[PDB]
Amino acid sequence: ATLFIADLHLQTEEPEITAGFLRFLQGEARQADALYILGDLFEAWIGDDDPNPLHQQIASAIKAVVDAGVPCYFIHGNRDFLVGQRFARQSGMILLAEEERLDLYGREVLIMHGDTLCTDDQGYLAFRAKVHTPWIQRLFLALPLFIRHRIAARMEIMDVNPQAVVDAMERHHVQWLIHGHTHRPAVHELQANGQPAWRVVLGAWHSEGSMVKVTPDDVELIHFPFHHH
Amino acid sequence: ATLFIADLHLQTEEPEITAGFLRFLQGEARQADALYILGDLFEAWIGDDDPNPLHQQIASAIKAVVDAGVPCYFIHGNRDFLVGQRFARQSGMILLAEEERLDLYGREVLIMHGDTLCTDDQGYLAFRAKVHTPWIQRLFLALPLFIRHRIAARMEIMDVNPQAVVDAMERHHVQWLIHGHTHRPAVHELQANGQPAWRVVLGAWHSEGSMVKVTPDDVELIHFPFHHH
Numbered sequence: 468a469t470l471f472i473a474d475l476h477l478q479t480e481e482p483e484i485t486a487g488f489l490r491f492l493q494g495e496a497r498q499a500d501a502l503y504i505l506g507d508l509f510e511a512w513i514g515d516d517d518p519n520p521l522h523q524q525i526a527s528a529i530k531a532v533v534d535a536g537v538p539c540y541f542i543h544g545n546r547d548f549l550v551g552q553r554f555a556r557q558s559g560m561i562l563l564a565e566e567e568r569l570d571l572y573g574r575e576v577l578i579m580h581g582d583t584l585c586t587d588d589q590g591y592l593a594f595r596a597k598v599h600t601p602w603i604q605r606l607f608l609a610l611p612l613f614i615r616h617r618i619a620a621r622m623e624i625m626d627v628n629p630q631a632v633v634d635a636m637e638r639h640h641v642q643w644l645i646h647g648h649t650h651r652p653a654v655h656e657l658q659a660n661g662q663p664a665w666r667v668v669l670g671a672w673h674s675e676g677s678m679v680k681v682t683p684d685d686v687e688l689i690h691f692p693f694h695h696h
Numbered sequence: 697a698t699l700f701i702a703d704l705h706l707q708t709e710e711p712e713i714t715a716g717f718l719r720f721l722q723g724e725a726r727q728a729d730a731l732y733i734l735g736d737l738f739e740a741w742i743g744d745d746d747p748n749p750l751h752q753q754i755a756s757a758i759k760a761v762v763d764a765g766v767p768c769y770f771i772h773g774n775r776d777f778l779v780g781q782r783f784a785r786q787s788g789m790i791l792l793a794e795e796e797r798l799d800l801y802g803r804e805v806l807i808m809h810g811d812t813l814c815t816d817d818q819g820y821l822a823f824r825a826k827v828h829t830p831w832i833q834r835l836f837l838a839l840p841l842f843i844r845h846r847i848a849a850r851m852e853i854m855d856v857n858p859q860a861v862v863d864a865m866e867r868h869h870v871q872w873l874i875h876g877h878t879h880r881p882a883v884h885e886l887q888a889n890g891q892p893a894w895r896v897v898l899g900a901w902h903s904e905g906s907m908v909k910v911t912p913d914d915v916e917l918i919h920f921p922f923h924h925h
């Protein structure tokens with residue numbers, strides 16, 4: 468049971484989601500082989516030096532799971548691309564690249580956030596290009612926190628381009644893609660590498676949580692309500 | 697692990713779905729405590745005397761699960777309201793009423809197909825009234841098969857009315873509703889009986905299968921692709 472979650476959008480204004488996530492980490496995650504968070508863990512991020520107490524509660528909760536012997540990994544989303552090595556160290560999470568090919572019990576699965584598949588939004592992709600330029604990140608991060616805050620203040624999700632999906636799955640020569648970003652949880656069948664292929668999409672956390680569970684024989688998208696209190 | 701499925705729409709034209717369902721019965725269902733099929737098992741039904749070979753393949757498959765010690769139950773959908781005691785006997789399924797209150801490990805859950813919640817479609821509800829009138833059923837069933845076939849030949853699903861949902865859950869004084877019909881798989885939070893309540897909606901089988909799994913502590917909506925061949 469390797470688990471994948473994404474699009475939690477954690478924030479001070481939404482304690483119910485935080486509580487749901489902690490319940491998950493304390494419970495489900497402990498039994499897993501591993502946990503991958505495929506981005507948008509946080510609703511926003513202006514750097515690891517944010518003293519926001521939510522960041523340390525979450526880091527602790529995740530580190531307790533790493534310490535229990537369950538490795539956690541993180542791929543950045545569009546919201547939390549500035550999560551850095553200091554958060555990694557406090558949470559014990561390992562930071563991965565924007566695309567990764569896993570070998571899950573012999574099954575080869577491409578994981579990403581999914582925003583890069585959304586090639587029909589020039590708007591977003593121009594933005595992403597800039598905020599992913601390292602010197603623009605280093606610049607922003609060197610501003611005083613209170614100014615980073617002011618900047619962020621001012622600041623419908625386009626769905627994936629079908630071709631971009633195929634291309635990605637072909638580049639990795641894979642039959643399996645898990646991603647988030649779009650907040651449209653679903654299982655999709657398609658063709659890639661001349662064969663049947665599946666794109667499994669995670670949901671955002673608000674009413675419910677969602678995960679993907681990958682076992683030797685099965686791949687399941689699971690929704691769960693926040694009922695267990 | 698009590699399981700709920702619905703909206704399979706089984707038919708000769710869709711062998712892939714049949715194969716997916718058989719895989720499920722041979723696999724997942726065997727480990728369950730029980731299986732509830734909440735309607736639209738079949739795309740159509742003109743009476744238990746249909747010699748359609750698909751009907752006997754399915755009856756056998758389900759009966760093998762009943763025989764393995766896993767009780768199967770059926771609530772009619774809008775498509776297969778004419779499933780009768782002869783199919784029940786051949787499949788070993790027990791036929792339930794349009795609404796049922798289960799006690800699942802101390803948790804009280806209302807199950808139905810869901811069509812009765814769709815009170816905004818007069819069209820459909822007028823139709824349903826008539827085709828559920830026993831003498832209109834007895835009439836239709838007494839016509840020669842070939843004429844039933846001719847009749848069926850000529851023959852967007854409206855979503856649930858939010859109030860009808862509340863009313864149903866209030867009538868049964870329940871915090872949990874599982875249903876199908878709408879083909880919009882999801883978990884929904886609402887208020888009923890002055891408290892948090894959840895409506896869990898199953899999906900139709902085409903790309904994927906879906907189930908709801910109810911355990912002592914958890915209620916999960918699960919999508920799964922047809923990958924395991």
Ligand SMILES: Cc1cc(C#N)nc(N2CCN(S(=O)(=O)c3ccc(NC(=O)c4cc(CN5CC(CN)C5)ccc4N(C)S(C)(=O)=O)cc3)CC2)n1
Pocket residue numbers: 510511512513545546547549590591594597598599603604607618619622623624
């Ligand atoms: C390195 C650096 C520099 C500067 C500066 N200087 N600022 C930062 N921020 C750090 C991150 N924070 S943040 O966490 O608060 C954040 C804020 C907004 C987004 N925006 C998008 O991701 C985004 C954006 C668009 C397109 N932009 C064009 C149009 C603007 N006119 C819209 C469309 C959709 C979106 N997403 C789908 S969406 C709908 O989820 O937001 C992302 C992160 C803000 C400051 N970083």
Ligand SMILES: Cc1cc(C#N)nc(N2CCN(S(=O)(=O)c3ccc(NC(=O)c4cc(CN5CC(CN)C5)ccc4N(C)S(C)(=O)=O)cc3)CC2)n1
Pocket residue numbers: 739740741742774775776778819820823826827828832833836847848851852853
């Ligand atoms: C007892 C008896 C008598 C007679 C007669 N004599 N016929 C039968 N049939 C047995 C069942 N078969 S069936 O299995 O082939 C079947 C066919 C159609 C439906 N129709 C609906 O369920 C239905 C219908 C509408 C509304 N009707 C009004 C409008 C018609 N002008 C549309 C809207 C939506 C629908 N559903 C959501 S939908 C979109 O899924 O179909 C159901 C079962 C047909 C014969 N039974």
Ligand SMILES: [Mn+2]
Pocket residue numbers: 474476507544648649650671
């Ligand atoms: Mn998101």
Ligand SMILES: [Mn+2]
Pocket residue numbers: 474506507544545546580582647648649
């Ligand atoms: Mn995103």
Ligand SMILES: [Mn+2]
Pocket residue numbers: 703705736773877878879900
């Ligand atoms: Mn249906």
Ligand SMILES: [Mn+2]
Pocket residue numbers: 703735736773774775809811876877878
């Ligand atoms: Mn139906």
